[PDB]
């Protein structure tokens, strides 16, 4: 036909040389698996001129293992499109294992894997794996398992064509934050269908017919598909089989077809054939409840029970994968089942679909090392474990080291019964003893000798608390919490060993409840052990228990749930009690001192000051206050005369109001050669439930003083020349000196700081006739300039 | 020294830190203890600092559901107890401990027990073989008292040891190479992990450890060697430590990380503890020199002992220059299981310088009166003529006498034609480093004018020099 041109052939196994590989030449669909492996002495040249373009689908799975020599599948299966995964190879529908010389994966026409996962592993030279978007290929992307390929290290490089060359024509794809174009080889880019279309798409992106799967030659045609969703019939894909019967869940067949299979299997007891029968408009190899079949191929409902018992080879079956589980579809088990599902991936859905119909087990049930097996509920209809064959020690149920086993059954809904054997439970961390005791009750074991081997101290690292504790009273200091939960005792208060109170810092109302974990201080609850309350008489007299936790940081939030501690015993119950996860926060208190007071002479008007928040605000830091004290100048500075021998030349180096979150401040108005005491504090709150210290000078005069004044002379007589000077007031006025020169290189004099002020005192004396000059250095603390004009006069003595 | 200690009711339920200080320095306790610690941090050292001094205890000793106590090595000083019927079943020592690993180094000290049984239940990480030594070395061995599937069940009685085939050392790197070890099937060995610690020589595995995570040992991981094709010649595992302290003793040992097995579980291996010295290297830090002048010809300085001795510190060298003005296990086991499953189905049968010897100080001999100096300090750890030394810098100057600076010599005013005069003057000789009076009245003279030709102070670099007494003379009319 126009959809599938070639034949359909059963599963193949190509081994030890590629000579037998001449079977895929004419097949388009394989009703089985395709295994190509163990052909060491083959070389790439052998695969240089071998291809299989007509193959388009593999129903079960594809496996390749140590096929030496071939470098890529891009020339071997150019047209493979769909792997339905009806029967899987250990959860996997595509497997590539230890392909020594394989370099890139090819298979650019693969566009849907209906069931199972993919496992490409230990290919020492394989790359072009990160360049594949599995989310589009598998309708579910998790559970994939690709590791130890060359791409994992060695910085293997892949070069997707088109988009990287500016030619586009290579779809970009999604990564959590690093979108990238994706491809199978350096010359084949993966197809991506527009979301509106699992159905196929054309070259330009038009949607194919709703029944087509993967690809189609022209859009919106029931025919011309490449692969069919649901069922295929004579060149078109149909939603369901028209009256023809469904066969192998992928195609339609007539009555004669199934009749031939029935006759052939009857005529040949090959142990590879099935007495195919018809049932519920389907052609199937084994039709419970309809076991009998007449001379027709149609099975009919039974009169009386007809369970379709399933007999186990050697009497023990290990359910280690979906492949093992799937082998029991539709099954009463005439043996014992061992469940050994390792690995982190969870497959409870598949187990229920395959094993959910089992109603009884003849032998024992053993569950060992099942890691990600959360619950046994997937045995949706198991109701009897006869125990005719027992695990050594006479155990009927045997659970050991189930890291995540949590619930056996919904005992409110379920029923169970075991006619013999004991019960064994060991090292199951998260299985609470309450469930085990319920099973003891609802399994008939309590109805006889009992003496089951339930290892107390199961349930560790899990919370099995079945009662509440209520905080009857609380107090909130800024460093302490009073806490008084209501009293509680088991039926016999001697079982009460005390209270264990848990707490940690929790700045948010969302926190995970206790589950049983370590005690490292980085994240774990801090635990304080509390002795039991006194037992005197009825509660009306006996006070409630309580605690006083102490040493807390103020104003922060904590979760302070409490739980009881009791002695364990098979004889006794009331496994414990646990309060809620209530939040409380200690009261706030006055903040700490502000940090890092800094000063700078930025602007001549005022000091500019910066600070840092208090080390511990002890509250929601909201408010700051600053004092700027305008200190007066020191005492001796107004009178001390520095003209004295040895005495050095001197040098130096309410308006208050609060401030908003801004952590810097500037003020208006100040002197020059100035800068004074600052003290400031912070507030987390008119109550003013709130000083750091810093003193700093600011700019000097910031201009040149060079103060003008009565610089003129007046010659009354020799030594009476009447030279005067006036006080500088704009700066702080702490005049260090006035330079007096009698210019002979300006022979100089110093001026007394206040004897001059008495009445122009300390004037120069004893002048000679002729020109004389002077420029007065009315010197401030800095005194960089301060010189007047070098005025000169002709002395006439 | 003896500190007899007694308590109300005799029994104290010690906690992590609080209530630990009470027994500080106590001994021959007239009481009992419960030591119920299940949290905290830095428990080993703190408990040592408070309880590390007990030598004997009366009554009985109980350790109950303590979580973070990996071992009672911090109890090591305990070496006797006045055993008496102070516990149910006449018990004397009572343990009942999630992470307990060992009690004490049984090769080091004995322990005397007056009487009574012993209790050991639910101690998952304490090896049962370790309990056997507790039987032998304690005074309760066998005949006198009675004391298996509740302790050590999660431990591993490693019964093979790894030799360190090849060891080489360097200035900051040690190279190790131990003999290879493979379980019955090589896939189980996830790899080696190496422990090392600076040991200035008696440390043991468990010292300084608690479940809270304060382990002193530094730990690194080494993957297995690339397995050799030839079964009888393989690649010796190895590792190369880096960033180490020179001349420093390091204690190291290795432990295999082998995966579990449902049937007979293969046991790991541990090498012994070995100590290796990093090689010596030249020191490089005569740090923090401090200097001051004792006198004009006496210069004194100190310096800090090197922070990087890098070898037994030998003489110092000083020079002066006159510059004058579980998930992983499951992952690996799942890979192994899938590989085994694949194999199970696809195969079917048919210059002035000194050499200071000891002290970090020196007073250099008499030298120029006031000049500064540039000083070099170098440390060494080899007195051999092939010495190794590698120079801190600090500057200092000698203080001035300030008396030789004064002229104490010729000064007078030469008199000449009317209003012509000049003050001759003598430059100080060998001074400790301008000049300025008359009427007072002031002036300054400097280097420039001394080539041209009343009091004077005659010192610039130091002030308040002796003011020469005035020279009086008549007007120059």
């Amino acid at each position: 036909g126009h959809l599938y041109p070639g034949e359909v052939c059963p599963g193949m196994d190509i081994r030890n040389n590629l000579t037998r590989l001449h079977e895929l030449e004419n097949c388009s669909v394989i009703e089985g698996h395709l295994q190509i492996l163990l052909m060491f002495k083959t070389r790439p040249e052998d695969f240089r001129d071998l291809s299989f373009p007509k193959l388009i689908m593999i129903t079960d799975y594809l496996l390749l293992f140590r096929v030496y020599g071939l470098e890529s599948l891009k020339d071997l299966f150019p047209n493979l499109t769909v792997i339905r995964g009806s029967r899987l190879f250990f959860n996997y529908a595509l497997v590539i294992f230890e392909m020594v010389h394989l370099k890139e994966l090819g298979l650019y026409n693969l566009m849907n894997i209906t069931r199972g996962s993919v496992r490409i592993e230990k290919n020492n030279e394989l790359c072009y794996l990160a360049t594949i978007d599995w989310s589009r290929i598998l309708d579910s992307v998790e559970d994939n398992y690709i590791v130890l390929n060359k791409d994992d290290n060695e910085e293997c490089g892949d070069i997707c064509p088109g988009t990287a060359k500016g030619k586009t024509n290579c779809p970009a794809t999604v990564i959590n934050g690093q979108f990238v174009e994706r491809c199978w080889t350096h010359s084949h880019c993966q197809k991506v269908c527009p979301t509106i279309c699992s159905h196929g798409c054309t070259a330009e992106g038009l949607c194919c017919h709703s029944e087509c799967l993967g690809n189609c030659s022209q859009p919106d045609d029931p025919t011309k598909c490449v692969a069919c969703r649901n069922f295929y019939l004579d060149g078109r894909c149909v939603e369901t089989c028209p009256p023809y019967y469904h066969f192998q869940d992928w195609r339609c067949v007539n009555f004669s077809f199934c009749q031939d299979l029935h006759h052939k299997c009857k005529n040949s007891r090959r142990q590879g054939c099935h007495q195919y029968v018809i049932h519920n408009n389907k052609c199937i190899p084994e039709c419970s409840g309809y076991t009998m079949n007449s001379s027709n191929l149609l099975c009919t409902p039974c009169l009386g029970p007809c369970p379709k018992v399933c007999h186990l080879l050697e009497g023990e079956k290990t359910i280690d994968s979906v492949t093992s589980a799937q082998e029991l579809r539709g099954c009463v088990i005439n043996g014992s089942l061992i469940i050994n599902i390792r690995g982190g991936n969870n497959l409870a859905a598949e187990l229920e679909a395959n094993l959910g119909l089992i109603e009884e087990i003849s032998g024992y049930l053993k569950i060992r090392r099942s890691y990600a097996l959360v619950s046994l509920s997937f045995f949706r209809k198991l109701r009897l474990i006869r125990g005719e064959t027992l695990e050594i020690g006479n155990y009927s149920f045997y659970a050991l080291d189930n890291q995540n086993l949590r619930q056996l059954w919904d005992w409110s809904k379920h029923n169970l019964t075991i006619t013999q054997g004991k019960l064994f439970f060991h090292y199951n961390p998260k299985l609470c003893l309450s469930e085990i005791h319920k099973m003891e009750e609802v399994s008939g074991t309590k109805g006889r000798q009992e003496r089951n081997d339930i290892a107390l101290k199961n349930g560790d690292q899990a919370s099995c608390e079945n009662e509440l504790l209520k905080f009857s009273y609380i107090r909130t200091s800024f460093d302490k919490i009073l806490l008084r939960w209501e009293p509680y005792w088991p039926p016999d208060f001697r079982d009460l060993l005390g209270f264990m109170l848990f707490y940690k810092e929790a700045p948010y109302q969302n926190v995970t409840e206790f589950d049983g974990q370590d005690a490292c201080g980085s994240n774990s609850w801090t635990v304080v052990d509390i002795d039991p309350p006194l037992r005197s008489n009825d509660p009306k007299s006996q006070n409630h228990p309580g605690w006083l936790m102490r040493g807390l940081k103020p104003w922060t939030q904590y979760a302070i749930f409490v739980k009881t501690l009791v002695t364990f015993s098979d004889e006794r119950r009331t496994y414990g009690a646990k309060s809620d996860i209530i939040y409380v926060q200690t009261d706030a208190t006055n903040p700490s001192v502000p940090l890092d007071p800094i000063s700078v002479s930025n602007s001549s008007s005022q000091i500019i000051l910066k600070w840092k928040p208090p080390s511990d605000p002890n509250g929601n830091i909201t408010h700051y206050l600053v004092f700027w004290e305008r200190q007066a100048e020191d005492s001796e500075l107004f009178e001390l005369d520095y003209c004295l021998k040895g005495l050095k030349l001197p040098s130096r180096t309410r308006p208050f109001e609060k401030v908003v979150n801004k952590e810097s401040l500037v003020i208006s108005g100040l002197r020059h050669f100035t800068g004074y005491r600052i003290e400031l504090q912070a507030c987390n709150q008119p109550e003013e439930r709130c000083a750091a210290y810093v003193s700093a000078r600011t700019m000097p005069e910031a201009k040149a003083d060079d103060i003008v004044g009565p610089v003129t002379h007046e010659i009354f007589e020799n030594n009476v020349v009447h030279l005067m000077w006036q006080e500088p007031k704009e700066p702080n006025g702490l005049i260090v000196l006035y330079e007096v020169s009698y210019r002979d290189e300006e022979l100089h004099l110093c001026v007394s700081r206040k004897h001059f002020a008495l009445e122009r005192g300390c004037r120069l004396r004893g002048l000679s006739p002729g020109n004389y000059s002077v420029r007065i250095r009315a010197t401030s603390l800095a005194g960089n300039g301060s010189w007047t004009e070098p005025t000169y006069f002709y002395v006439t003595d | 020294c003896p500190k007899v200690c007694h308590l109300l009711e005799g029994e104290k339920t010690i906690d992590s830190v609080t209530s630990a200080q009470e027994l500080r320095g106590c001994t021959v306790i007239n009481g009992s203890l419960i030591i119920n610690i299940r949290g905290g941090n830095n428990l080993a050292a703190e408990l040592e600092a408070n309880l590390g001094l007990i030598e004997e205890i009366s009554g009985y000793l109980k350790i109950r559901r303590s979580y973070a106590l990996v071992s009672l090595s911090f109890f090591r000083k305990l070496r006797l107890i006045r055993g008496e019927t102070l516990e149910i079943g006449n018990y004397s020592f009572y343990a009942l401990n999630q992470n307990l690993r060992q009690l004490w180094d049984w090769s080091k000290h004995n322990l005397t027990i007056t009487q009574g049984k012993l209790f050991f239940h639910y101690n998952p990480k304490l090896c049962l073989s370790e309990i056997h030594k507790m039987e032998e070395v304690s005074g309760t061995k066998g005949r006198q008292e009675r004391n298996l599937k509740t302790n050590g069940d999660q431990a591993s009685c490693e019964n093979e040891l790894l030799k360190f085939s090849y060891i080489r050392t360097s200035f900051d790197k040690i190279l190790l190479r131990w003999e290879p070890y493979w379980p019955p099937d090589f896939r189980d060995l996830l790899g080696f992990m190496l422990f090392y610690k600076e040991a200035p020589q008696n440390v043991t595995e468990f010292d300084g450890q608690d479940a809270c995570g304060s382990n002193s040992w530094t730990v690194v991981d080494i993957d297995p060697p690339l397995r050799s094709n030839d079964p009888k010649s393989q690649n010796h595992p190895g590792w190369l430590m880096r960033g180490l302290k020179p001349w420093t003793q390091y204690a190291i040992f290795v432990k295999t990380l082998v995966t579990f097995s449902d049937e007979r579980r293969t046991y790991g291996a541990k090498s012994d503890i070995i100590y290796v010295q990093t090689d010596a290297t030249n020191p490089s830090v005569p740090l923090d020199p401090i200097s001051v002048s004792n006198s004009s010809s006496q210069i004194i300085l100190k310096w800090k002992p090197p922070s990087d001795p890098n070898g037994n510190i030998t003489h110092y060298l000083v020079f002066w220059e006159r510059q004058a003005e579980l998930k992983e296990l499951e992952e690996s086991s799942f890979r192994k299981t899938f590989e085994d499953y694949l194999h199970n189905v696809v195969f079917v049968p048919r210059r002035p310088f000194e050499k200071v010897v000891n002290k970090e100080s020196l007073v250099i001999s008499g030298l120029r009166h006031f000049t500064g100096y540039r000083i070099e300090l170098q440390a060494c750890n080899q007195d051999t003529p092939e010495e190794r030394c590698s120079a801190a810098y600090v500057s200092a100057r000698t203080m001035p006498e300030a008396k030789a600076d004064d002229i104490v010599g010729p000064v007078t005013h030469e008199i000449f034609e009317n209003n012509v005069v000049h003050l001759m003057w003598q430059e100080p000789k060998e001074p400790n480093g301008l000049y300025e009076s008359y009427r007072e009245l002031h002036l300054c003279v400097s280097r420039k004018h001394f080539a041209l030709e009343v009091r004077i102070r005659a010192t610039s670099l130091a002030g308040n020099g002796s003011w020469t007494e005035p020279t009086y003379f008549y007007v120059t009319d």
Binding site: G11, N16, N17 | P184, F186, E263, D340, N344, F347, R350
Partner: protein, 50 residues
Amino acid sequence: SETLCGGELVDTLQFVCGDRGFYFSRPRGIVEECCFRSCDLALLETYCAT
């Protein structure tokens, strides 16, 4: 001979069979024989097609 678990099993068993192919015909495991137990040449040859 001891054990041959893992890739060693394939490497060694290939050497035993040589040019002969591994016998297969679709309708305990070999690992149960030569990984969890001691293995000898007399048994490996049964996995080659004579």
